[PDB]
Design a protein around this ligand. Structure first.
Ligand code: GTP
Ligand code: GDP
Ligand code: G9U
Ligand code: CA
Ligand code: CA
Ligand code: MG
Ligand code: MG
Lengths: 437, 62, 280, 417
């Protein structure tokens, strides 16, 4: 058994992290006080869930997790919330004042004051691991902390754990829940600085989740709680194989091997089905075929984009629930004859499938109805480059007049880091077009 | 359509169905760039105190 | 009041569509690069489809189908008709063609041919077709001709064939009323029976082939697009397809009627305010 | 995140005192400092403005004792910390130089002693809020002198002002254009955010809209109270966003010198307004407090706050609505430059209200207006002896005229970009 450490940075990463660890506890049967009645090996183990939970002599199950925010209001609610007993006080890390939506402030100014402490708290978890695989890092593209501090943290992790894998879950910025005009700036700066340090990154567009909440949950103005409980389900499907018995994606190195043939093109598109409402009075349970087909509808993707106008480099199907292989190949057979599904030539056209028989779990009283079978598709499409083009265009509009640049320079950044970052992105859009058209 | 590497266990199964085959910066470098940024801040703040000191002298002269 | 932008300044058709829209009192035109638009009359090349449908509060419509190029680029069209099973290898209305490839398989055992004409086989260093040796001649004058049909495909993927088609070979445009009357007197048949059935079959077949690849039914922006098909009629009154044009112009007298039909069916269907087509 | 509030001179102390009367009511604090509220939303960020009874983190500054004796005698006069009344005796004679260079220089160090003792006992100081007029001598000259000393001592805190602009329509002396031009030069270099409150606009709203034929300064200041309350709602009440002075500045100010905001309020009362009316009134020229036609320039940034119980869906619908008909009036090179915030607690006597904050290039009209009145006198060097008698030279005037014409230039280039 090989441990994984999760690092939640900034508001988005912490609130999404709350949502995930709650869901993990419900799925593994760990109570809010850290006890796990079904764990018969009191005080240790090398079970699958031990990848995410260490154990105390008193039987407490502790997330291999570190929470980091430059200001204390959000991580304070975890200190006092319903899962306070879950964490060691010193895996929650806060400071005095935040980065004010400013990448330079989270990275250069306010970042250096806390980077060594956080690395110390992380190192304290790494020494409790017989064979650490690497890290899962949760953050927003758009915040000052989520972008600025995370890229600083990523640099040092490469230096201190050069042989470990680093996966990301990144919240990509959407105006209908945005919080700063300058998020396109932070987004590009942090992608540029983090690219070579990340093995695999799952982008979640707030726009996509927001619309999936309104359309399929009948929530008129979705909250972060709505957005984040749905995100927790996608993350839980992605990580289910690190936490449960199985043979697909059993360690972090397998995510890169299976989804990332070129290092820089390491942004798989996640699609999920089905998403239903808990207050749907009468609901017919969808079939294997129905939910697999739903994997090829943009309206179910974590990022809006049109995969018919790109090329696949890898596809992975992750099912939870009442699913047997025969149904999956019947549903694939049929969809292949209906859908434009084009791979790149130097890659086999086909699918890696994993099935976990436990159906998805839901937060009791939440908005997602319980379903009998669900699926998350992970595919490496060149279509995801649409989201880089959108973001780079917004960056170009503002930077052509230097709007807001003075806020970054005032923290010690140079204009060169902007144009350097933007040029790396222009290279990233080219790489995608090589492979895709 | 061919199936490969079928693995079963109590929790589920995994497998691969094919449809058609194919045809770092040192800690010192970080340290340099960070400190070059903090120098730039202090330079800017030293300039601000410099112009303020000039304003102080004009206040005295008036 | 609806909003729209213009990004192909020298498109006769959408020059006229924009003009009509303004005269509604219900459409304002913005600057090319303002994103808060309902409707985009887009550039012919590198249209930024990936930036559409991301404006909260804006239903967005565009006058091009992403992927329609597969039908409007000769090289692509030939690949589509040879390789798509819905069109089969040799579908009997497309001249046998070869696409910088197929040289070897290019059965060359009348062996005249033809761009992107001769009788002996390649030094123009493009696709190669059978030139139709025996076309159909309007008399008097033993004159050749080809047939232009305008087809509108709305956001619902309805297929609308404009009933006014032009024949360029007389006033060099011969319109349908004249051509029909000719066929009756000269051949004892109608334009509908001898020719148009084949044309409607060909338009249907092409556009239904690519429908799964370019349909915007469940997309986050919507598309319509005006096409121009070009056919040749041979002497056994059989109809052949030449090329599909993705950004056609209209004939002079028809610019008025067809640009109204576009607003009616392609635009106001999606953006309602305060038949000239044949549905295929 | 504490804020230190400073009010200087006659106008600054009169508006400052109404402000503390309004928000103390909102927060349940009574004229004695004691809390009698019913909700805890009233206390979750009570610390931003109050120290623990509750005493405002407020410093009252004047060169005469007149207005401050009023404040001490008025509604909530005893709420204020007695050690925080800092004043001299001779006044400043509506003269910027007396406030900035002579009279004011004698008093400023004492003011900074009270500023210093208020900052020290702050867990995490956000920065400073100043109320003052630009047309007199204390709020203007001594006010901007304070801002210079505060920036030197606290160079990395936010500085925010509510700045009342002179106007011939409601005017105390002919030298107001001089005082205001000297002040704007200071404000352009030493504040992060300046709320431009124009006495012309306040008068016209009171006359044309409120149907007050003889508007007093108290009628003008009731409007300033509401706007200041609205504009600080997000700082004083819990929200999905964590509004603080620095985030406002980062998101509102794309160019360091263009940080002069146009405030506006709606409505200016038995029928509550429907959300469509709020958003329509809010953006109406008639509802804005700087006397500039927003349709004469372009919005660089906009922040709108709705107060009360309403359909956030209809807010978003109406906010998105208004942008997609006046898109000619928002710059296209700052994507998504309109932010929207909502707060459940309405202000007293309203179930629904909305507060607008606009960084529009139309504000150049206001600086042009000041520049013309200035040049008209300065061209004949009229009334200058009042300032040369305090040690000033003509050059400092020419420098301030030039810097303000430049400011107008800068606003004009971005209006055409
Ligand atoms: N999905 C989701 N997105 C969030 C959440 N919180 C914030 N965001 C998004 O995150 C982006 C930036 O905000 P934050 O992550 O909150 O910023 P932060 O890292 O705390 O940084 P500072 O507060 O600037 O120091 C915006 O796009 C928000 O929409 C969340 O809980 N869920
Ligand atoms: N809106 C408003 N303006 C005022 C008030 N008092 C004075 N003014 C204006 O303030 C300016 C004069 O400055 P004032 O505050 O009287 O002088 P100071 O004591 O020298 O600061 C003029 O432009 C007046 O019109 C007030 O209570 N409200
Ligand atoms: O803190 C704030 C604040 C502070 C005091 C009063 C009112 C407000 C408005 C609510 C939001 C801002 C900050 C903010 C975040 N994103 C933005 C995008 C624009 Br455009 C303008 C501003 C902001
Ligand atoms: Ca155990
Ligand atoms: Ca004296
Ligand atoms: Mg934060
Ligand atoms: Mg006075």
């Amino acid at each position: 058994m090989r441990e994984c450490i999760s690092i939640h940075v900034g508001q988005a990463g912490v609130q999404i992290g709350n949502a995930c660890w709650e869901l993990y506890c419900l799925e593994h049967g760990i109570q809010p006080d850290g006890q796990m009645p079904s764990d018969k090996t009191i005080g240790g183990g090398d079970d699958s869930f031990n990848t995410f939970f260490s154990e105390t002599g008193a039987g407490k199950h502790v997330p291999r997790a570190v929470f980091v925010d430059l200001e204390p209001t959000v991580i304070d609610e975890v200190r006092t919330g319903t899962y306070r007993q879950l964490f060691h006080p010193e895996q929650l890390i806060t400071g005095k004042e935040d980065a004010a939506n400013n990448y330079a402030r989270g990275h250069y100014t306010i970042g250096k004051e806390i980077i060594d402490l956080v690395l110390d708290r992380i190192r304290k978890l790494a020494d409790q691991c017989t064979g650490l695989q690497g890290f899962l890092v949760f953050h927003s593209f758009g915040g000052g902390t989520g972008s600025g501090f995370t890229s600083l943290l990523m640099e040092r992790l490469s230096v201190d754990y050069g042989k470990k894998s680093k996966l990301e879950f990144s919240i990509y910025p959407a105006p209908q829940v945005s919080t700063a005009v300058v998020e396109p700036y932070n987004s590009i700066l942090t992608t540029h600085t983090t690219l070579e340090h990340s093995d695999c990154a799952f982008m979640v567009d707030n726009e996509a989740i927001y619309d999936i909440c309104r359309r399929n949950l009948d929530i008129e103005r979705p909250t972060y709680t709505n957005l984040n409980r749905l995100i927790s389900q996608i993350v839980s499907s992605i990580t289910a194989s690190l936490r449960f018995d199985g043979a697909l994606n059993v360690d972090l190195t397998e995510f890169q091997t299976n989804l990332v043939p070129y290092p820089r093109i390491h942004f798989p598109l996640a699609t999920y089905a089905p998403v239903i409402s808990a207050e749907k009075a009468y609901h017919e349970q969808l079939s294997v075929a129905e939910i697999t087909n739903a994997c090829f509808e943009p309206a179910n993707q974590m990022v809006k984009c049109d995969p018919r106008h790109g090329k696949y480099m890898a596809c992975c199907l992750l099912y939870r629930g009442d699913v047997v292989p025969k149904d999956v190949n019947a549903a694939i057979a049929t969809i292949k004859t209906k859908r434009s599904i084009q791979f790149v030539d130097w890659c086999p056209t086909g699918f890696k499938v994993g099935i976990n028989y436990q159906p998805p779990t839901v937060v009791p009283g939440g908005d997602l109805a319980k379903v009998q079978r669900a699926v998350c598709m992970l595919s490496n499409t060149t279509a995801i480059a649409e989201a880089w083009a959108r973001l780079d265009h917004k960056f170009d509009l503002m930077y052509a007049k230097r709007a807001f640049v003075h806020w970054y320079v005032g923290e010690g950044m140079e204009e060169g880091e902007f144009s350097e970052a933007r040029e790396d992105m222009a290279a990233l859009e080219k790489d995608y077009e090589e492979v895709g058209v | 359509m061919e199936v490969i590497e079928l693995n079963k266990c109590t929790s589920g199964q995994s497998f691969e169905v094919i449809l058609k085959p194919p045809s770092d910066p040192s800690l010192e470098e970080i340290q340099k760039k960070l400190e070059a940024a903090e120098e730039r801040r202090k330079y800017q703040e030293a300039e601000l105190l410099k112009h303020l000191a000039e304003k102080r002298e004009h206040e005295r002269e008036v | 009041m609806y909003t729209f932008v213009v990004r192909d300044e020298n498109s006769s058709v959408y020059a006229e569509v924009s003009r009509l829209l303004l005269a509604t009192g219900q459409w304002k035109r913005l600057r090319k690069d303002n994103p808060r638009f309902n409707l985009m009359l887009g550039e012919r090349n590198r249209l930024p489809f990936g930036r559409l449908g991301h404006e909260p509060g804006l239903v967005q419509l565009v006058n091009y189908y992403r992927g329609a190029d597969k039908l409007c680029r000769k090289a692509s069209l030939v690949k589509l008709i040879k390789t798509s099973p819905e069109l089969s290898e040799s579908c009997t209305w497309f001249p046998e063609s070869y696409v910088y490839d197929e040289r070897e398989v290019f059965a060359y055992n009348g062996n005249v041919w033809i761009k992107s004409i001769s009788s002996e086989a390649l030094d123009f260093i493009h696709v190669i077709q059978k030139y139709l040796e025996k076309p159909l001649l309007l008399e008097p004058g033993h004159r050749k001709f080809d047939i232009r049909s305008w087809v509108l495909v709305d956001h619902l993927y309805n297929i609308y064939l404009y009933r006014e088609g032009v024949l360029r070979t007389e006033e060099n445009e011969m319109f349908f009323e004249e051509f029909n009357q000719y066929l009756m007197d000269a051949l004892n048949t109608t334009l509908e029976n001898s020719i148009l059935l084949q044309i409607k079959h060909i338009i249907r077949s092409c556009l239904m082939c690519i429908e799964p690849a370019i349909s915007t039914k469940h997309l986050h922006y919507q598309s319509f697009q005006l096409f121009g098909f070009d056919f040749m009629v041979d002497e056994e009154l059989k109809v052949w397809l030449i090329e599909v044009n993705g950004a056609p112009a209209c004939a002079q007298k028809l610019y008025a009627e067809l640009c109204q039909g576009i607003v009616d069916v392609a635009i106001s269907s999606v953006f309602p305010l305060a038949s000239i087509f044949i549905k295929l | 995140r504490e804020i230190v509030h400073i009010q200087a001179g006659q106008c600054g102390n009169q508006i400052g005192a109404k402000f503390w009367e309004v928000i103390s009511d909102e927060h349940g604090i009574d004229p004695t400092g004691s809390y009698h509220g019913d909700s805890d939303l009233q206390l979750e960020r009570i610390n931003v403005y109050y120290n623990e009874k509750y005493v405002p983190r407020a410093i009252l500054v004047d060169l005469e004792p007149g207005t401050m004796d009023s404040v001490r005698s008025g509604p909530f006069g005893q709420i204020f910390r007695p050690d925080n009344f800092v004043f001299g005796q001779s006044g400043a004679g509506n003269n910027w130089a007396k406030g900035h260079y002579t009279e004011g220089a004698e008093l400023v160090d004492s003011v900074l002693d009270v500023v210093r003792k208020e900052s020290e006992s702050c867990d995490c100081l956000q920065g400073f809020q100043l109320t003052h007029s630009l047309g007199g001598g204390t709020g203007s000259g001594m006010g901007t002198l304070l801002i210079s000393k505060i920036r030197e001592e606290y160079p990395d805190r936010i500085m925010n002002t509510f700045s009342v602009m002179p106007s011939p329509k409601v005017s105390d002396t002919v030298v107001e254009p001089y005082n205001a031009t000297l002040s704007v030069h200071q404000l352009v270099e030493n504040t992060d955010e300046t709320y431009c409150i124009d006495n012309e606009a306040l008068y016209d709203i009171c006359f044309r809209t409120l149907k007050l034929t003889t508007p007093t300064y108290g009628d003008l200041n009731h409007l300033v109270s509401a706007t200041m309350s609205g504009v600080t709602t997000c700082l004083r009440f819990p929200g999905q966003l964590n509004a603080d002075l620095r985030k406002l500045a980062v998101n509102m100010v794309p160019f360091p010198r263009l940080h002069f905001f146009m405030p506006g309020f709606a409505p200016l009362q038995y029928r509550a307004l429907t959300v469509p009316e709020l958003t329509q009134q809010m953006f109406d020229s008639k509802n804005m407090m700087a006397a500039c036609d927003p349709r004469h320039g372009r919005y660089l940034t906009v922040a709108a706050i709705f107060r009360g119980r309403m359909s956030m869906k209809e807010v978003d619908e109406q906010m998105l609505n208004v942008q997609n008909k006046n898109s000619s009036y928002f710059v296209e090179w700052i994507p998504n430059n309109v932010k929207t915030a909502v707060c459940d607690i309405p202000p007293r006597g309203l179930k629904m209200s909305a507060t607008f904050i606009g960084n529009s290039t139309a504000i150049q009209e206001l600086f042009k207006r000041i520049s013309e009145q200035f040049t008209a006198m300065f061209r004949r060097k009229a009334f200058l002896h009042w300032y040369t008698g305090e040690g000033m030279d003509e050059m400092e005037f020419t420098e301030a005229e030039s810097n303000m014409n430049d400011l107008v230039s800068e606003y004009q280039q971005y209006q055409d970009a």
